[PDB]
Amino acid sequence: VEKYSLQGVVDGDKLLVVGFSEGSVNAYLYDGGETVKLNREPINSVLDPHYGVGRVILVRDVSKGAEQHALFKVNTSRPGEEQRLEAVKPMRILSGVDTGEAVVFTGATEDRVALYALDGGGLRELARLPGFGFVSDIRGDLIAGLGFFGGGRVSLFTSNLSSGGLRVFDSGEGSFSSASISPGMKVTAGLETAREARLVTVDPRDGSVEDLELPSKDFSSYRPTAITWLGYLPDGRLAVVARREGRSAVFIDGERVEAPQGNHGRVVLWRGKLVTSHTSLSTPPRIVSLPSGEPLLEGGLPEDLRRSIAGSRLVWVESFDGSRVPTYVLESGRAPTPGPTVVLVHGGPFAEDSDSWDTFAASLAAAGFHVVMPNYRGSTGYGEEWRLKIIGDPCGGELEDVSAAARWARESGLASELYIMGYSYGGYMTLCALTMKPGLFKAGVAGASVVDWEEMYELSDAAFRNFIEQLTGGSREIMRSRSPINHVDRIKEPLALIHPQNDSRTPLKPLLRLMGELLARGKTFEAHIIPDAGHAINTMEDAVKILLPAVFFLATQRER
């Protein structure tokens, strides 16, 4: 079914959206009635637009999933007419923003990640970022942003539009989750500490980290623990979407706004009426109004794929270190209790299983499988402490917790059998759970998985090279003993390896040596290499592409 993410306004007050619609991600214009297409070809994403500008910056995969993006400036008045910003080699755009006079954005290549500036003079490199870095906001000649530069920690990075450059602002307390410039050009960020979460006023000149205060104190009472996203509206109001335990709240000047139960994010000022992008375990990402909650954009979701879940529960699991991992349950009406159960680990890992829409969680509970979507340490939304616990310890505690969700299930009386399923870092978890715990589960599905750190290293761009060092405390001896490939002499339960050939995140190269390894020590497994597919789905299809083989493998087990 169709999906719509909020991008922002342009054309004055013509809401800009993006839709996973008809087997393709397309940028869209919405004027309160009939959505209008912009892109010609299925795109991938659309650079954060700056309110009311008459053009859009499409982000296209010119490599077929490989993540090498080409930029096209599609004037909004002329839907379907595109200009490939040629003064920009295809690369990996992590994020950017367009102001209508010039485009800045972050790109990572073999050699480096840097903040780029495309204006009416040609290409310019603003600043070279340590590793994964994102353009949060631009206001004036200012450039506010985020960056994973050290310790799974997130930092505040600021640059310039003309002279460029960059100074990185840290917090001993915690990481940053999003920012947006204010009138005072002081970066209003959200400090996520091992503790809780709140706003701060990080000033560019000296880097003052004073606490930010809001008029209404709802947000200051919601006791947020992790700020999804935030940012000022044109009227001048600071839009803050915090959240705790998978659910979020709309706050304007502290002033809480009533919104559909689940999750939202970017909030906008369309025709002067607040608007965000809802998503719930049962409702797929969509664009609604607030606080009324009426949906402006939502795709025809069946009444059975929502009926394919008898219920949901946030249970808190007892981890080995006595840590409680906040887990997400999903009963599969099309299954009994206990019954077959699959442990669906979110990838990331700095992601999480919240009360939001998960296509795997749905299909799964639809396949007669209850689901367990634990927020192991490294996950997001549960404090800077739980997320930084993984750094340097990939495939350790988390796994344990990921195993503690498994533990729960059977004794909890809901699992008659347990299988672990995952993608990306989740695919990676399916591999450690199976190599480090050749028994916990009945079987494992790994997709766009991580099988060798040292190779994924020798096959990654500057973005990804740095990411690893971090998640392993800059030590090879981890990329060695925390890479399942070297632990293939110990796997016992079956395993399906779903993998996109062109994935440039989790390459296929090291994944094919893994299959070949399995074949040596003759292990029972099945491989799935999807064609011209990368790490994500820029089509409605490739959802089912790496989710069709899975279920069969996962149902073949069912019958012993």
UniProtKB/Swiss-Prot annotation:
Principal cellular location given in the protein's record: cytoplasm
Cross-referenced InterPro entries: AB_hydrolase_fold (IPR029058), APH-like_N (IPR054035), Peptidase_S9_cat (IPR001375)
Molecular function terms, GO-annotated: omega peptidase activity; serine-type endopeptidase activity
Keywords from the named record: Cytoplasm, Hydrolase
Annotated EC: 3.4.19.1
Chemical reaction(s) catalysed: Cleavage of an N-acetyl or N-formyl amino acid from the N-terminus of a polypeptide
Domain of life according to the entry: Archaea
Subcellular location: Cytoplasm
Disulfide cysteine pairs (residue numbers): none
Catalytic residues (positions): 424, 503, 535
Entry GO CC: cytoplasm
Gene3D superfamilies tied to this protein: alpha/beta hydrolase, Peptidase/esterase 'gauge' domain
Enzyme class: hydrolase
Biological-process GO terms, alphabetical: proteolysis
Record's function text: This enzyme catalyzes the hydrolysis of the N-terminal peptide bond of an N-acetylated peptide to generate an N-acetylated amino acid and a peptide with a free N-terminus.
Family to which this protein belongs: Belongs to the peptidase S9C family.
Official protein name in the record: Acylamino-acid-releasing enzyme
